Amino acid sequence: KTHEVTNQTPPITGTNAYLGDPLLMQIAARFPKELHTELEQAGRFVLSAEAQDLARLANTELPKLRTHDRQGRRIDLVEYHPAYHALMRRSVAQGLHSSIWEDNPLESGRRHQARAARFYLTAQLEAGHLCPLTMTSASLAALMASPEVYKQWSPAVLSRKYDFSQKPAFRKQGVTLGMGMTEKQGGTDVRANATRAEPAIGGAWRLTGHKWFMSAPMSDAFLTLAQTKEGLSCFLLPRLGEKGESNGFFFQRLKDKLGNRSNASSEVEFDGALGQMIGSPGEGVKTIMDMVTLTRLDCAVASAGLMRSGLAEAVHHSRHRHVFGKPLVEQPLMQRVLADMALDVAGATALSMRLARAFDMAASDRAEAAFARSMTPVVKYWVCKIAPALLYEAMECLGGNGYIEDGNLARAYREAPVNAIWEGSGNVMALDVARVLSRAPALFDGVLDWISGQLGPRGQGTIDVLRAALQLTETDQGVARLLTEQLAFAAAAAELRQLGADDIADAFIETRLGGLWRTTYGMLDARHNAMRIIDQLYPAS
């Protein structure tokens, strides 16, 4: 041999991602014991060596579109690696697509939070297959606009048996649902959709057009927007007909994507595809409003989990990798970088779960409903859009191996932009935040009141900043991103206080609410012990 291999970091595999995360455990502290037991088992699974192999395979053995069979007939099939189906099977059995719609007494009053904690853990393992599960869970809220259609589909949708066979949906053990919104001329401006729907025999509708981005193409049906005589309408469009034949779907290509690669995203064209209208004619936008809101929470929770998993690897690496004779984690500068990132990961996780809590409490508490209506785009804006910069710095903490695809940080870095881009990007979230202030000032008083209650009298200066930003946004729409980010900082700070993470909150408040312009991590002085921040959030395991 020419050399020895020394000073290598042992893998994080085999430990428990839930029990290694005290902030998450505090977030779940009031869950019933049965949920704690399930989260510990989930925490063990997502760091197991077998699960990590499935995640690597799903993202390297990529889905393939087969437009035709060997004799020249169209079949419009997308084939996946078995690893994809194994992840789907377990997450569907776990109810990640269905549990908020189920009647489970152990989760009463906690359905969004219980699911969000599971979602957060799974996103640390493999994020791509979460897309069909997010769309399936959220799609049922659109189906509520037509209760007969909900009653018809929900038994099949809520089934916890995953079924990827090419049977018609009504013969499958369970079904999944997708979304056909974006067209080539725009995904934001859905009223510019040119897909058209025309009445057909039997009260159905026939659709002709295209959708430029349709993820999870082997879903059994798709919520789709199309124009009718009275405006943009929403439809439930099955991929297959009752005998299993194609329903006018023509897949053109799969996207060659930066990340999210385990999840096939197709370009599709429709020729006479038959479907049911969902909601009132011309009310397509209103019909899908609650569906989109549900996907935005998932985008935040998953981005937070992505950041958590990437930073845990950086902290763990620092504890074992020696440089100049001692572990990297004993270097003051590495301590400041790791602790500074931990503050944002902590704030993003607390805020994302606080939004889930507002969803659970909205029906019984007007102030929580106010938070739920107005802050979903704030949380999606900030949590998702900080992930690329933070995951890059976490990757840099690994040195050269961090840049190599046989690890996890490269894949997570490639993944991070998708949650921010996939549905409403930053500018769309921020304008949404400003519109709600223009139409419902009372909602932001309620949020400001919750923030002020948690920060206490010392936080009144932050409240004044937020009011000034709200008022300035009415003067100038261009400052809507400033308003959105400041709201997120303040709400994350408030929740860290609510959770009792007072050392974390102190340092978070001093920097994000009191510090100066910065562009890189590590902007902490010695006033707060950095090693304590790191040990509190990433205890050595």
Add this chain to the structure above:
Amino acid sequence: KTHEVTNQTPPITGTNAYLGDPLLMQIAARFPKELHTELEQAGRFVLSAEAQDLARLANTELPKLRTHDRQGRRIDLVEYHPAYHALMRRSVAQGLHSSIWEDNPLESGRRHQARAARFYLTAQLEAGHLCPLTMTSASLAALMASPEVYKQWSPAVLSRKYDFSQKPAFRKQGVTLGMGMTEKQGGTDVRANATRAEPAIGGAWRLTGHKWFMSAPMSDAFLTLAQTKEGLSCFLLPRLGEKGESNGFFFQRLKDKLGNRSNASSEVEFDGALGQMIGSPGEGVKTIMDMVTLTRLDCAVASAGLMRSGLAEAVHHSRHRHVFGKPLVEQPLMQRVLADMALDVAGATALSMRLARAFDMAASDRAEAAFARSMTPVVKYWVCKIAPALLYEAMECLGGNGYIEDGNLARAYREAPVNAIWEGSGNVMALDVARVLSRAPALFDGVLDWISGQLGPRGQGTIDVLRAALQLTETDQGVARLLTEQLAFAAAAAELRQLGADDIADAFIETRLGGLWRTTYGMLDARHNAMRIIDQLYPA
């Protein structure tokens, strides 16, 4: 047809990346006429459809390691797509590996700046093949430590004829040089290297060990660190022997990289590889100090070019893509986001080229030499490390297509971290700054005087901030990144004043030096006039 395809952005291909960049033209305003002509031709090349096809192919048709031939002999060859060799050929013919060492009277007093302007443009086209050119240009500063080896190798190294054949080095039309430094147990702590060098017949040395990341493996020789009885020493190690036979290189694998994929990076093991010592025994670290410094300017210049190119695409898209009946560039919020990114790209470009100017003036100006020694890690820290976050936001400005690999932003986003990581990352740059503060505080006094002269009396508040940061860093090594980033902000602001970009400087100073903690772009109010910033830096 089922639908019409409408509201699409016309391609930016076919225009001129140099003439479309007023800040760059201002930076080059005093270059001789012949240099202006050459930059205009390069500006057209990097946006031409032909060149763009080469850049795409070089990054999708990946190099393959061939350890053996089909009969089972070791050959240790790496094969590239012809597009890689075409980019190398043109860049070598342009002297990107050699021009600072040439005696070109047209570039007298400007060698580093003239090369940096070319580098900036080429990085907008294809960054991966720049790695061997950066290493080759920088390697000559180390070879100077042994002047007889410099005389022996420099005609071949400085040749503008690219030659990728498998001939021995002195039978080729020109040669390139790489770097064998990082080992599995560490790339930062090179004194923990375990590769060993032993005396051989004829005054040569035999090396046995491994290098964990060796880019451009078909380079003709590599500057390599290995242990001798006196400590860590530097060696020039040819890949092939005098007859074209293997010189004890055993390539194991190529890295499967996030980005930079046109540039092969190998894992290699050395078994009795014959080389020449460069510099004194045990002085390997000192010998490669200037070589490393040169590569650090290149990292900054290229990262600035990456950012410039990605933001130019986002601005161009906004001018053509309609949403809600008007161009995106007419939406106030999109204007704030684009302008806010433009301020960092302008500051990073100005600061990087200002470092190049310090390199040109160092031999004749003590204040400029002080700037070059103390601020090289500052520029590399800030310019390279802001690129990932900025290129993500630029990608988001394109919408869903931004995330797709048939465009350019996804590749640039994957490229962006490599300049920060490839040689000394942020923590290493910041500790470099802290060491210079500890061992030679007067160098930063000179930097502050230069900043103060450019900012004018209005800037005393920024000087006081920098003094406080210097004092605090002497107290606490842990705040070294704060000192480093504040120095970059202030020097970027000062250089924008030096360039006469006073509207850009005004807006940059008020935000980066006077604003609040932020994590995303778009933090400008109406006083900064976002549309004028965009039109001044990215004219349609």
